[PDB]
Symmetry: D2
Subunit: 153 residues, 4 copies
Amino acid sequence: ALQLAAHSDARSGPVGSNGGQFWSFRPVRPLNKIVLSFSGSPDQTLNLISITFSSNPTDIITVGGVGPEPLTYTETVNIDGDIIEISGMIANYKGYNVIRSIKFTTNKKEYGPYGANAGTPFNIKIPDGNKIVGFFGNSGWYVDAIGAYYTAK
Amino acid sequence: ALQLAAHSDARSGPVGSNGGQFWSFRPVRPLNKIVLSFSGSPDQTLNLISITFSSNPTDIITVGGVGPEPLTYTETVNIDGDIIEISGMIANYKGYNVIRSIKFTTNKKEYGPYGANAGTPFNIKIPDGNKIVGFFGNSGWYVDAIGAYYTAK
Amino acid sequence: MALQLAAHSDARSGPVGSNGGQFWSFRPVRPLNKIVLSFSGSPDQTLNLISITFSSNPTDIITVGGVGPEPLTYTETVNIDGDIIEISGMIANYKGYNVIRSIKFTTNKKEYGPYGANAGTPFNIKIPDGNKIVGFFGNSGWYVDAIGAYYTAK
Amino acid sequence: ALQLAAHSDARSGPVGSNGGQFWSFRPVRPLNKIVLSFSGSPDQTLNLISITFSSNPTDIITVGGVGPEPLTYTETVNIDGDIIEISGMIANYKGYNVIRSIKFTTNKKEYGPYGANAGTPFNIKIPDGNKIVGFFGNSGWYVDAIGAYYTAK
């Protein structure tokens, strides 16, 4: 049978730092929901612990949060349209450089920033006419690194 | 700590044919369940239409199965230990070369092959001492191509 | 502290073929303009693809396959004009291994090949419309076991 | 007709910043010669503009240096061993964040850092028992980002 070469989407990143596990999530249908969980609080500071990406109840991934630290705040966001860019801050949290804040931008609106403001900035940008269709990265107790899969609209 | 570059696991594959969408699923925790959905019937010929990979608990992906055709049979595979090899057959279906049967092999037990085991064979093997920790590929109405992410135990 | 502006990696198509001892990858900054195919055996009979040499002016070059003792007896020099859009060929058994045996390169206008032993299992590397192939990767040892391409929009 | 899945090596990185062109160089034999091309002068400021990686014999690639700025100094690094880590500094040059200095480290020797050793540090390390067998990144007039391919020794 003819081996008709199968394709893999281009990538941007990862940014952030090395973690114990590589992770990757590129669903067939567009991402429409993101759930972010933190420890701490606004009064002090929100420590990003995990992020959950979903396309529906049958397509979900959770990165970070494998540690014992109790979560104190979670927020569920509905993503309208295609993500086109993300940015955020990276900084040390209990001995590890991790993603500390994140902001998503689609062709419809902005979401965030969610997390702590301080540290080194990062941002994922793609060429004109493209959309982000998945994410990948490294994680452990926290979200250490993140990058995106993108393709032409 | 140090600003260490993040890593991406090695890949094996993909095998099969190009498809409309690229898909990827590499969860932090070990893949422990796989649900294969087909059309047709066991006493006749099973037609793989979609596959669902999951990791305990809230990590799941469903690839293929975007078309109309109703599901008439499903095979639930509960994985024990680390998958180290997968194999199966590729053959034409309603005008498309797609994965038609698949088998998963761990360190001590085998699961399958499930589906219509006839056509062009394939198998994903990895270096010894490694384990498969995720899968990626192409899909549309069906599962067009498949490959694996692996890393050392 | 410097902004971490995520760097990109081109999309891929493939690889097709079979697993091999070494992974190889060659994606030069400039266009891929010359490809040299090296074979063993006499061409008035049957040529066995042993290695491929990809290059890009002025001096970017890579040679994959050909690590073994088989001598090269014939070479084919393909001077690519334009952007490569697709490649194809055949995979067959050679001395116990499933390897790339023939290969054809296709740009927008003309096409080069196929060269080698055009017999066995066909493969085809096609990219989306408006894109071009800008590099190759694969597995190889004594022979060229597998190959794939990197592509990006024109 | 057996489709025995072909593999692709694990990756570390890339680090730095997005660039106009993606580049990749992973030769069959190990790397043994690296040429760093700079602008300016050793006594003043050394500006890394391009890098030439080489694996004897004939396997060579040059990334960065596509710009008009003339080279005025080069550092030839002959490595006789397996590279296990690289590191360096990133900092601005003509309005762009680029790789400014770089150091290569094998199982038993260090080479560098060569270039303007100032700015934001980067470290690409790999799991123990592995070796870097290739490099990839983005570049234009300069070397914007770099990452490595690695595999078990």
